[PDB]
């Protein structure tokens, strides 16, 4: 990955409740990511997680929790892995 510690602005303070939230494969949603960070997962991990599991806050947590921040190092046969 890449160092993550203060850089991009959170942006989108308030306003606009639901801009575009449909049940279709696509990038994650701030909230979905924010809701993740809450559980105890670096945003990056949250965003990366959602991406891993397509974009399921649960699927992510289900793992992020089970594992406990770190993601599955053996989730993808050939891909990213600390090892």
From Swiss-Prot:
Membrane spanning residue stretches: none
Domain UBA: 27-67
Source species: Mus musculus (Mouse)
Stated name of the protein: NEDD8 ultimate buster 1
UniProt induction comment: By interferon.
Protein purpose: Specific down-regulator of the NEDD8 conjugation system. Recruits NEDD8, UBD, and their conjugates to the proteasome for degradation.
Higher taxonomy: Eukaryota, Metazoa, Chordata, Craniata, Vertebrata
Subcellular location: Nucleus
Subunit structure: Directly interacts with NEDD8 and PSMD4/S5a, a member of the regulatory subunit of the 26S proteasome. Interacts with AIPL1. The interaction with UBD via UBA domains facilitates the linking of UBD-conjugated target protein to the proteasome complex and accelerates UBD degradation and that of its conjugates.
Source organism superkingdom: Eukaryota
């Amino acid at each position: 990955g890449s160092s993550g510690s203060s850089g991009n602005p959170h942006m989108w303070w308030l306003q606009d409740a639901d801009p575009e939230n449909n049940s279709r494969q696509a990038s994650p949603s701030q909230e979905s990511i924010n809701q993740l960070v809450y559980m105890g997962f670096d945003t990056v991990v949250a965003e990366a997680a959602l991406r891993v599991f397509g974009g399921n806050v649960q699927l992510a947590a289900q793992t992020l929790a089970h594992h406990g921040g770190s993601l599955p190092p053996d989730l993808q046969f050939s891909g990213p892995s600390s090892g």
